[PDB]
Amino acid sequence: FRKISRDRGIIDKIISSMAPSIYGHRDIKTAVACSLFGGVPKNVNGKHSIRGDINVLLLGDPGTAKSQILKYVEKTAHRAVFATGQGASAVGLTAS
Amino acid sequence: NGDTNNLSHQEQEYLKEYCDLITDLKSGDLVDIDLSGSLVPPSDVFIDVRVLKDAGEIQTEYGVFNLIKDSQFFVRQSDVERLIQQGYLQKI
Amino acid sequence: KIYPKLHQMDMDKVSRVYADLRRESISTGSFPITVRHLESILRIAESFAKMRLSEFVSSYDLDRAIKVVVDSFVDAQKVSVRRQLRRSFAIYT
Amino acid sequence: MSLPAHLQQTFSPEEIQFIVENEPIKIFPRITTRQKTRWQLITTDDKALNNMVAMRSTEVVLWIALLLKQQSKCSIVAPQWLTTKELDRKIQYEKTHPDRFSELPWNWLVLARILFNKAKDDFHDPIHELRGKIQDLREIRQIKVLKGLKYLNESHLQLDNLSLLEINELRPFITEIMDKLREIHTASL
Amino acid sequence: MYYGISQFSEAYNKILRNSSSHSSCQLVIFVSCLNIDALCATKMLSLLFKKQLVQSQIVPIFGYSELRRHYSQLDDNINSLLLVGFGGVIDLEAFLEIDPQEYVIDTDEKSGEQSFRRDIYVLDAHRPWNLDNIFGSQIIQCFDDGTVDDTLGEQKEAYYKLLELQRKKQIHEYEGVLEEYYSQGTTVVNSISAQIYSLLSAIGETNLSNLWLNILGTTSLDIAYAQVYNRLYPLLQDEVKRLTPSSRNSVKTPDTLTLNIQPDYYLFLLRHSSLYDSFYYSNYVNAKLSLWNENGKKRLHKMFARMGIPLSTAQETWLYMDHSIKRELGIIFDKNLDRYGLQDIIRDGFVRTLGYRGSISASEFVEALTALLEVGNSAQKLTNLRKRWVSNFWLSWDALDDRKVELLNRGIQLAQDLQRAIFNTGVAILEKKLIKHLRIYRLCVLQDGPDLDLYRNPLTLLRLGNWLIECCAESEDKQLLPMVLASIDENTDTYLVAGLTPRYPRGLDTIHTKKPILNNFSMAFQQITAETDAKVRIDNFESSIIEIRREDLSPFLEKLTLSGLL
Amino acid sequence: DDNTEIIKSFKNFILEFRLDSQFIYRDQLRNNILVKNYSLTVNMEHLIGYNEDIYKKLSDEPSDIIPLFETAITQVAKRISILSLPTFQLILNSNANQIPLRDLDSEHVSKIVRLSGIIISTSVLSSRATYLSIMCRNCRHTTSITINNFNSVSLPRSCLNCGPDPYIIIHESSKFIDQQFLKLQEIPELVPVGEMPRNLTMTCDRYLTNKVIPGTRVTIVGIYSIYNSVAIRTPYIKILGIQSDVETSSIWNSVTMFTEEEEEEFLQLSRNPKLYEILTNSIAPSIFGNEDIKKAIVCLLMGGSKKILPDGMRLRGDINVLLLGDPGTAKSQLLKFVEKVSPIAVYTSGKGSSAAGLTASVQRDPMTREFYLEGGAMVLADGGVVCIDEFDKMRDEDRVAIHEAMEQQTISIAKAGITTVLNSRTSVLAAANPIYGRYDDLKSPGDNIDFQTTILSRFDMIFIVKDDHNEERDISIANHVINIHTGQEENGSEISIEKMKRYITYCRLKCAPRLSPQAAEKLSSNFVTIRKQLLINEESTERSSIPITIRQLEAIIRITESLAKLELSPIAQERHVDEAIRLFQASTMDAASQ
Ligand SMILES: Nc1ncnc2c1ncn2[C@@H]1O[C@H](COP(=O)(O)OP(=O)(O)OP(=O)(O)O)[C@@H](O)[C@H]1O
Ligand SMILES: Nc1ncnc2c1ncn2[C@@H]1O[C@H](COP(=O)(O)OP(=O)(O)O)[C@@H](O)[C@H]1O
Ligand SMILES: [Mg+2]
Ligand SMILES: [Mg+2]
Ligand SMILES: [Zn+2]
């Protein structure tokens, strides 16, 4: 991992490796990679809490390979949960 | 030894006259004693003091003390008692 | 195992980008812009730094995050004003 | 006014110490002042200081003794009552008689504190043992004081052999309570 | 003139004779504000003068400008002046505008000597001595440790012949030898507290408190000048043996005071933190394991696992750690430290205990004092900062008393925090590879750190410099090179450049390691400042630390590289 | 044998310890005995310093060694107090590393551990047996038993012919002590990934009872023991010492606990000529601007004064604040900070709330089959602040349950045969968004607010925060946030959270100012002017959605009284009236005019 990281073009390879079976959408792959890696949460002096996660939304045409991208993200992420529109309740999410 | 806006005019005049009376009392046969002095019995002849507020080379009756802030003296309590009273020095 | 930090960064660049984004987003019906998106720019810079297992965010990562956010904002606009928006924001991207 | 409120009707501990340091004490001079300048004091006697010989018992004032001790020019001879055996005897006397107080010196607490702080190497016995004995004596006397405080009345009251520091500590409460009881009784008539 | 080792008693008697009158005070002591050794020496002197009822004033001082100001402000009733911790290298007569004629009182033709109202005593451990103060001047008296008689006979002869004067060739030879003597750098040769203790032993006022202060003063030099500490250690051992009661069978009492030579360790605050923290925040351990990256942490975890100490147990505080492991620690270290190259952690130190209180070692006490000195709590801001440091001096002074233990605990906590901050800064420096390597010297410049404010104090900068010197430089088998460390403060827009001498690998006795390494940066900095025009400040007592304007650092470093006198 | 030696060692430690010239524990024991406080607090560092062997013995077998220490303490107390007294209690203090609540396992069985958590439930005091008097049924043999509360005891199985278990306890001659049960949860920040918070059963005795209230973080020192309710044991904690950051004794009693050194620190702070600015700057230091909202939060924290009239009528003294604004205004962060700083506070989400959640719930006991009442956020946050985030998300049904709580400060329950009136004296700080997510100036205010006037009238101050895109303010906020991300005045311009909380408690428990006649006259004039302006501002198309009733006059009076209380001033003058009027104009009239 260290040897791979030392390479200059590591970010480009990482982006290209996101869902290799999807032809293009290099803007939906970059966002997915950024969300997967995420940010660093911060707690300033113990009083201020700042979120350290990245949320992504895909608003597109019916056949532009969005569900496949979500499935790939589910496979790659360490802990992932998949839910459908109407298949999810207000307390099925969150806690009940 | 011998703000005012809270006081009334009568109280201010009373305070001035009382200070004058105290000075007159100190000017009498009790000149050797300093009536307006410390009421804590003397315990140690020599003490360590520390300068709290910067001031020039103030020439006291006992001697000349160049009160540089943050500087310690090993002197007699009697000599620097007044300076401690006014807050220039500290016993520590 | 990686928690990157920001120590050297162009404050003026990010501030100007945020101000320009707000000014262009004042338009009715546009994509909302708030301090959340400045924090998102910083978060994306942190993520890009993390992708290299680097312990400190570099200027290149911040520039890439700025480009990503500005490109998304530009693409979110309408056809008529997209050309003007892209020309205006060409400096950052 | 001229006198603060906390110095009214009572003495502060510093005043009690000042009173105590006027009493005599025995010392061993480490210099020879006697001839075979001259002290000229106006509050105490200066004959003893002038006729001082090395390693010969002499009597001087406690504050002068402490001043000499600071210069390591005299070793203070501790009081006889400040021995472990004598303190143990006093503790036994206190325990056997729950109604009276032991005949300790009127300045035992103040003198003990002064000597412990200023003259630590002069004592023949370990300091910690003396501290423990003094603490035990103090607690026993405190128990006796608490038991005896239940008899406050409009008439007189007797507290024999009670030391100066304890009387100074108890003066406010005892005096005020007895004054109020006397006031109530006088109003009753 | 100078006083030999045996003349300390005579100098003390002279001070007693002149500056002693209950009517008024006539003794003033000037102390370096940011030197622990000077602090301890002045504490010893203060106690000694309190014993004899000598009226005195103690004035902390930072830099030569403040020395000049305070000396100009001195009264005429000061018969004797004490310069503790500085003044050896500079010409006090020339610097202070002291004209002997205006200071004389009486002159006797028969005696051939002149009496002066004011006398100046110099207690400086730095070298080389300024021959003007040693062999030329009479008002300036220097407390020499024997160096002048041991090695300065030839320079003495040369200077005397120069004063006494075909003759051009002889003058050339004498001035050449004088210049060669003056061309060397500056180092520390001895501890001033050791000289004060020698004086006390001469006049027979040595006790356990004086010995403790001497130990603290001597061990303050262990971090930088280990050769001096090694030279002075046997005497401290012998003195501790002499002053310790023969019988220790008596049970502990509330007033018992112990001073033992117990095995100490090159760990950071072992007795007031956790063992894991002690190994983590130690300069030597980090140098020998590279704890600034993940590999070092993994190696430390592996070491702790092989020693048999659970990670939870190791992170437990010292007081509540399992007693079996605490008792076995010596054996455990004896058998396991050699594997990871930490064989040098084993050492013998001085540990002081009070009845029913915790035990603290000399190194931990010095660390607490230094932490209190550092973080305890245009020209106007500089003056305010130096005033704050002068104030911190008194917190450090108070911490030396046994009644003020809360100050010592606060200093320990501040030391922990400061070490954590320095570790973070060093991690940032090393990860970014900011240490540029030039053939003549190394360079490291801080510009946008997270804790830049902490490094305005010279002591914190020196701490960071030592951390960096031990780590990745003392090791790696790299040729010794002086290091340049610079920091920036935005509130004033100026730099704080500090030259640092290289160090040999710790605990490696060798003929070349026996020889010392001199600090030549003062001479080069002075020459560059005189030749260049950048408004540089050399007012600090430690001549290697200077303040540089924001713009001029690049030309200054160019000239430094081109000079080749480092 | 060995027990006597252990007792002697403990007695020697008590009677011989000293760090300078005061016997700390001897004097402490005497002082405690003087005020009928039969206990003794021992710092474990001192025990380690005196003798490490004693500490080793105590740590090895706490359940068997602590009773000996209590016996030694009792003997020393009898020696020191009686001139020739139940068993004394030992309370321990330690600085050992805190073990996470979830890390407690088999390895920590029967050992002294330190941990911190949140108390979620407390039980009713029970009665334990210490001295039992027993008698045999057949031969009537009198006997006694002495019981210690530390569990590794029963009535004799054989008399001293008599059948098994022949002894019967005589009650009138026995002595009992107090016992309580607590439920301790783990801190939310310490919970592992994707796990529910864990509960732990704990017990306290005698002087450690009635020391904590539900919802307060505490630190506990105790023994990790087990009790058999077949191859398993139920874990529990035997409390030996409780340390909390909230003075619960001074909250539930009119009595106030503050050291003389504290009282004089809070007086000096109050004497500061500009304490208002310091407190305004001390709230949400990481949030830029919003000065008026910070002042409103200060007023809400301080609160007003409550008056009970001779006729029985009671007047509310709590201040409620509503924040209706656009996204990114930092309302939720302000709510979180308020929850953090207030002595008592509960942070709740409107979405994730219910009618029974936020008031009280009828719950049936599984065993007794009897119905009891549990408490909700407005009972758990009694005497504090309730931060109702996402106020708009709340269902109507749920919402409607809040009215009496806010106004009458009581909860009325008539369910499952339970008829009671609970007490809920709380302040509500709510945040919400408009109907469309932004305050569209094109549409009327009525269309931007779905809140009925009844709920809105109860809020003393309503803040309509609109995000305006100004280049200068945007640049300033960006710079502030960047400095926050990349990055301690404490020079009298700001005080930490702990000091502010303590000062709030002191001010609430100490001062309750009153209005002067000039203040009343000015307030009446302003109320008349405001009502006249509202009447004028009305348009024929719609009636004012933001109301102005007598409740607003009461709210302004409360704000003035809180401002006066801020400085510990017994009387409120026109100077505070002006500030209260300015705040009302800046928030409520500002919302209404639009
Ligand atoms: N003035 C400010 N200073 C600092 N941070 C700010 C400021 N304004 C907004 N933020 C940040 O913007 C983010 C907004 O999230 P927050 O939950 O606080 O918003 P909100 O006002 O409650 O909005 P919403 O109605 O969408 O829930 C937070 O990270 C907050 O830190
Ligand atoms: N860019 C693309 N590259 C490769 N395959 C694609 C691409 N876009 C669509 N497809 C194919 O078309 C199908 C799209 O279905 P899906 O993406 O699941 O529908 P939706 O986009 O509504 O989620 C997928 O089975 C995928 O294989
Ligand atoms: Mg789909
Ligand atoms: Mg929100
Ligand atoms: Zn029977």
UniProtKB/Swiss-Prot annotation, chain C:
Transmembrane segments: none annotated. It is found in: Nucleus. Signal peptide: none annotated. Belongs to the MCM family. Acts as a component of the MCM2-7 complex (MCM complex) which is the putative replicative helicase essential for 'once per cell cycle' DNA replication initiation and elongation in eukaryotic cells. The active ATPase sites in the MCM2-7 ring are formed through the interaction surfaces of two neighboring subunits such that a critical structure of a conserved arginine finger motif is provided in trans relative to the ATP-binding site of the Walker A box of the adjacent subunit. Component of the MCM2-7 complex. The complex forms a toroidal hexameric ring with the proposed subunit order MCM2-MCM6-MCM4-MCM7-MCM3-MCM5; loaded onto DNA, forms a head-head double hexamer. Present with 1690 molecules/cell in log phase SD medium. Early fractionation of eukaryotic MCM proteins yielded a variety of dimeric, trimeric and tetrameric complexes with unclear biological significance. Specifically a MCM467 subcomplex is shown to have in vitro helicase activity which is inhibited by the MCM2 subunit. The MCM2-7 hexamer is the proposed physiological active complex. This is DNA replication licensing factor MCM2. The gene is MCM2. The chain holds residues 773 to 865 of 868 of the full protein.
Curated annotation (Swiss-Prot), chain D:
One of its GO terms (cellular component) is GINS complex. Keywords: DNA replication, Nucleus. It is found in: Nucleus. Gene3D superfamilies: 1.20.58.1020, 3.40.5.50. The keyword Cell inner membrane does not apply. InterPro entries: GINS_A (IPR021151), GINS_bundle-like_dom_sf (IPR036224), GINS_Psf2 (IPR007257), PSF2_N (IPR056784). Its main location: nucleus. One of its GO terms (biological process) is DNA-templated DNA replication. It comes from the Eukaryota. Component of the GINS complex which is a heterotetramer of SLD5, PSF1, PSF2 and PSF3. Interacts with PSF1 and SLD5. Belongs to the GINS2/PSF2 family. Functions as part of the GINS complex which plays an essential role in the initiation of DNA replication by binding to DNA replication origins and facilitating the assembly of the DNA replication machinery. This is DNA replication complex GINS protein PSF2. It comes from Saccharomyces cerevisiae (strain ATCC 204508 / S288c) (Baker's yeast). The gene is PSF2.
From Swiss-Prot, chain E:
GO terms for cellular component: CMG complex; DNA replication preinitiation complex; nuclear replication fork; nucleus. Its main location: nucleus. Keywords: Cell cycle, DNA replication, Nucleus, Phosphoprotein. GO terms for biological process: DNA replication initiation; double-strand break repair via break-induced replication; mitotic DNA replication preinitiation complex assembly. It is found in: Nucleus. One of its GO terms (molecular function) is single-stranded DNA binding. It holds the Pfam family CDC45. The keyword Nucleus applies. Present with 1730 molecules/cell in log phase SD medium. Required for initiation of chromosomal DNA replication. Acts at the origin of replication. Also has a role in minichromosome maintenance. Assembles into a complex with MCM5/CDC46. Interacts with MCM10. Belongs to the CDC45 family. This is Cell division control protein 45. It comes from Saccharomyces cerevisiae (strain ATCC 204508 / S288c) (Baker's yeast). The lineage of its organism: Eukaryota, Fungi, Dikarya, Ascomycota, Saccharomycotina.
Swiss-Prot record, chain F:
It is an enzyme of class 3 (hydrolase). Its main location: nucleus. One of its GO terms (biological process) is nuclear DNA replication. It is found in: Nucleus. It holds the Pfam family MCM_N. It catalyses: ATP + H2O = ADP + phosphate + H(+). A motif (Arginine finger) lies at residues 457-460. Keywords: ATP-binding, Cell cycle, DNA replication, DNA-binding, Helicase, Hydrolase, Nucleotide-binding, Nucleus. One of its GO terms (molecular function) is ATP binding. The keyword Transmembrane does not apply. ATP binds at G325, D326, P327, G328, T329, A330, K331, S332. Its EC number is 3.6.4.12. Residues 275-482 form the MCM domain. GO terms for cellular component: chromosome, telomeric region; CMG complex; cytoplasm; DNA replication preinitiation complex; MCM complex; nuclear pre-replicative complex; nuclear replication fork; nucleoplasm. It comes from the Eukaryota. The keyword Nucleotide-binding applies. Component of the MCM2-7 complex. The complex forms a toroidal hexameric ring with the proposed subunit order MCM2-MCM6-MCM4-MCM7-MCM3-MCM5; loaded onto DNA, forms a head-head double hexamer. Interacts with CSM1. Acts as a component of the MCM2-7 complex (MCM complex) which is the putative replicative helicase essential for 'once per cell cycle' DNA replication initiation and elongation in eukaryotic cells. The active ATPase sites in the MCM2-7 ring are formed through the interaction surfaces of two neighboring subunits such that a critical structure of a conserved arginine finger motif is provided in trans relative to the ATP-binding site of the Walker A box of the adjacent subunit. Belongs to the MCM family. This is Minichromosome maintenance protein 5.
